[PDB]
Each structure stands twice: as structure tokens, then as C-alpha cells.
Write a protein that binds this ligand. Structure first.
Ligand code: QIF
Ligand code: MG
Length: 448
């Protein structure tokens, strides 16, 4: 057997049987042996066990001669930013993002906040930790506390021309995660009126786990937008590397359309740039990027693939439909803060509502949203789908599972790299009826 907490892209486990202070200390020792020379940035989220896991990590790192820079309670993107900004050897965020209260985890990066994933170091660490029965050494290096967020805040604000911002009324919903701290620190520098929902950080999560995809959690943001006449609403997961948008009618915006919107907003500042996108839903992003004078670059989904493709392409922006937005100037890392700043600027500068900015894109490229299927035999289910459609001779692409382009409609069908599911995305060229009949047809085949 192997330690179950070591996943494809990060560490995630129930505390204390799958993840605990002793494992965390061992992870720190193992990480020291994997990095180039330099100090290691540590930060943590609002979960009750997160401080103690970070302290154990720090103890293992310092026992192995690593200086530790403790940036304190923060968002995941702040570990990325500070790891790059401080020219650190690496960084670790202690977080379970959006998982239940008895779970925690770690996200690990090396120099320039490049990801450490299962095949790029994480499983090496796992196997080292699994075999480590050595006595815990004593610290041979120092810890410095560096909680100053000024550089990070200035960097966020550099994405917008503040003299063009209007005093929009924005609902913000931290979900009792960590986002509210950053909103409040940005607020003196912005003209917006914030309506704060579930704002105070609270690791007991009295209003539910910070997962804005849960319909009941969506409804708190929607209600606040509608009841206050807000221009739009923003909700974050617990470590706020994902943000979610609600238009002035309270409508949750499907994240697909944000990729094209943010690409056009970015390409205004940075003309002719490359934009990386995933293969699940594509047509709208390709069109919007091209119409803004950018170059769209198809990439396998998943932050490690997206970031490495952005690096190799010098891409200014990368976006996934699942609320991940990456920015070259942000060390090619994802931010849950930069996106709503860009959208607030777009609404301010264009005189258009968020609703209207995306409405014609939704009409032009209606999509199913991601639909998940737990099936008995994923390979046999996919084969059932492909055999059914074979006589139509779709254009097939294997960048990430199977993409089939039929002309007026297309789908992508993937096995997940983090769960044992099949995931389906369908979109059409302005045809809602075709979207539904094909989505239901594929759904029946997959369940068959
Ligand atoms: C961890 C993670 O959040 O999991 C998402 C879903 O990955 P998947 O199950 O393969 O569809 C990825 O898109 C995302 O980039 C990655 O950061
Ligand atoms: Mg997260």
C-alpha cells in the first residue's frame, strides 16, 4: 500500500489518520532534499489544524538546514506569489481548499512557484516519507515571520487602471474562508462598495464548507446581490484560488464564459498575446481570443499542464472552465483575486453589465456544463459512446480524453486525474435544442 494522502497534484487527507503532524514533519524533511538551494515559504489557511501542520513542516525543514519564511494565514496564491517574489527554493501552502472539516492538505511548489506533482517530485517525497523511520533531528536553520502583504497587494492592483474604476456595488462572499482579509486590505485603494457575506474567517465553518459550487452556498451570494441591487457578486473557495461570479440578476455564471471574457480583458492591455485554454469547452474561447487579436493555445486540463504550456509559449493568460485563471505576471500562477479585479474594470470601462457581457457568448456557444458519471466500466462506457457516433465521422482529438467535433456540436469526454469518474462537456453553435438532445443521448449511452 501507499500513503493515500499523496494525490496526483497535492496532498489531501483526513486528519489525523491520513495526515498528521508527524507526516507533516517528515514531508518537510523530504522536501528539503528535493529542492534547489534557498529558503522555503510556508503559509496556511483558516482550518483549525492548519497552524500545527505548518509548524511541523517548518520543524522538518529547519532540521534539514532550510531557512523558513512564515507568511502566516494566507491564500494559496500568496504562497505562490511570495515563493516567486522572495526568490525562494520552494513553498508549501497548508490547506484543504474546499473539503470537509476533518480534512487538510498541502500544495507544494519549487522555484518560481513551479508545481511539484506526482511525477515531478511529489511521489518521490511520498516514498521518502513512507520509508523515513529516522529520529527527528533538531533545527539547524531559522524561521523568519514575514506577514507583510504590501508587495502582493500592489501586484494585484497593478492589473487595473484605478482611475477608470467606477464605484460598483459588489457582493463578496468569503464563505468564512480567507478571502475577506484580502478584500478588506484592497478596499481602501478601490472605489467599490462591498456587501460582505460570510466574511469572517472561521475554521468551524458555521455557514457550511467553503465550496461555492454547492447550490445552498450559491444562494447566499445570489440573495445578497438581488437584495442589495449589486452590480455583481463574487464568491471564493476557502483558500481563494477559485472565484465564482454572479451577475446583477443573481445568476451564477458558468466558468467557461469567464475564460473568453478575461482573455479579451487581458488582450486589451497586452496585444497579440497567447492565451492557453483547456480542451473541455473551446469554441467560445478560440473565437474571443482571436477577435481580441490573441492566439489561442490548446492544452491538456490541469494546472501543471496549463502552467508549463503557458511558460513554453510566453502566454499572458491561461484559463480553465473550472474557475482556474493563470497569469504570466503572477509567476504563471493562479489567482482568485486578479479575475474579479479585471471583471470589475471591464464592467467599469465598458458601461455594460456582467450579465450582458456574457449573454451573447452564452447564446452563441451554449454548453452543458461539466456532467460527471460514476460508471461500472469507464473504458467500456466511452467505447459505447464512440461506437454510437462513429458513422457521423467526427473530427477526433486526444489531447485530453476524447474530443469529437461534429460541425455544429462537439463534446469532450475525460477520465478525471483526481477522481475515478467520467466527465462530459458538450457545446453547440447557437443551438440549445441540439445541446440538450445530444447531452441526453450521450448521458444515456454512458449510463447504459
Ligand atoms: C486540482 C485541481 O483543482 O483539480 C481540477 C480538476 O481536475 P480533473 O479531475 O482532472 O478534471 C483541475 O482542473 C485543476 O487545474 C486542479 O488545480
Ligand atoms: Mg482552492
Amino acid at each position: 500500500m501507499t500513503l493515500p494522502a499523496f494525490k496526483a497534484y497535492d496532498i489531501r487527507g483526513r486528519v489525523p489518520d491520513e495526515l498528521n503532524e508527524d507526516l507533516a514533519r517528515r514531508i518537510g524533511v523530504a522536501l528539503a532534499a528535493q529542492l534547489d538551494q534557498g529558503p522555503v515559504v510556508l503559509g496556511h489557511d483558516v482550518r483549525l489544524a492548519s497552524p500545527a501542520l505548518q509548524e511541523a513542516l517548518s520543524a522538518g525543514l529547519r532540521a534539514s538546514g532550510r531557512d523558513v519564511i512564515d507568511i502566516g494565514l494566507c491564500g494559496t496564491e500568496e504562497v505562490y506569489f511570495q515563493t516567486d517574489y522572495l526568490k525562494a527554493a520552494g513553498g508549501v501552502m497548508v490547506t484543504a481548499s474546499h473539503n470537509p472539516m476533518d480534512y487538510n492538505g498541502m500544495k507544494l511548489v519549487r522555484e518560481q512557484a513551479r508545481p511539484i506533482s506526482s511525477d515531478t517530485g511529489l511521489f518521490a517525497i511520498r516514498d521518502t516519507v513512507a520509508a523515513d523511520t529516522a529520529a527527528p533531528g533538531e533545527p539547524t536553520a531559522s524561521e523568519q515571520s514575514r506577514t507583510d502583504k504590501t508587495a502582493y497587494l500592489e501586484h494585484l492592483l497593478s492589473y487595473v487602471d484605478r482611475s477608470t474604476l467606477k464605484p460598483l456595488k459588489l457582493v463578496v462572499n468569503a464563505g468564512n474562508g480567507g478571502a475577506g482579509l484580502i478584500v478588506d486590505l484592497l478596499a481602501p485603494h478601490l472605489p467599490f462598495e462591498f456587501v460582505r457575506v460570510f466574511h469572517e474567517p472561521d475554521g468551524n465553518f458555521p455557514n457550511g464548507i467553503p465550496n461555492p459550487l454547492l447550490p445552498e452556498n450559491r444562494d447566499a451570494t445570489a440573495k445578497a446581490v438581488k437584495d442589495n441591487g449589486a452590480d455583481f457578486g463574487i464568491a471564493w473557495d476557502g483558500d481563494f484560488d477559485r472565484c465564482f461570479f454572479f451577475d446583477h440578476t443573481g445568476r451564477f455564471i458558468e466558468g467557461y464564459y469567464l475564460v473568453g471574457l478575461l482573455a479579451q480583458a487581458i488582450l486589451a492591455k497586452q496585444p497579440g498575446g497567447k492565451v492557453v485554454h483547456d480542451p473541455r469547452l473551446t469554441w467560445n474561447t478560440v473565437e474571443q481570443v482571436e477577435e481580441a487579436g490573441g492566439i489561442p493555445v490548446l492544452c491538456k486540463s490541469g494546472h501543471a499542464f496549463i502552467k508549463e504550456k503557458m511558460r513554453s509559449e510566453n502566454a499572458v493568460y491561461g484559463g480553465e472552465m473550472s474557475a482556474h485563471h493563470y497569469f504570466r505576471e503572477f509567476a504563471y500562477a493562479d489567482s482568485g483575486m486578479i479575475p474579479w479585479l479585471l471583471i470589475a474594470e471591464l464592467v467599469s470601462q465598458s458601461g455594460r453589465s456582467l450579465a450582458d457581457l456574457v449573454e451573447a457568448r452564452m447564446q452563441k456557444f451554449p454548453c452543458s456544463g461539466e456532467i460527471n458519471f460514476k460508471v461500472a466500466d469507464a473504458k467500456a462506457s466511452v467505447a459505447r459512446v464512440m461506437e454510437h457516433y462513429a458513422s457521423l465521422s467526427p473530427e477526433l482529438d486526444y489531447t485530453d480524453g476524447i474530443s469529437a467535433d461534429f460541425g455544429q456540436w462537439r463534446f469532450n469526454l475525460r477520465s478525471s486525474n483526481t477522481e475515478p469518474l467520467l466527465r462530459l462537456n458538450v457545446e453547440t453553435r447557437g443551438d440549445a435544442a441540439l445541446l440538450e438532445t445530444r447531452t441526453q443521448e450521450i448521458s444515456n449511452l454512458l449510463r447504459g
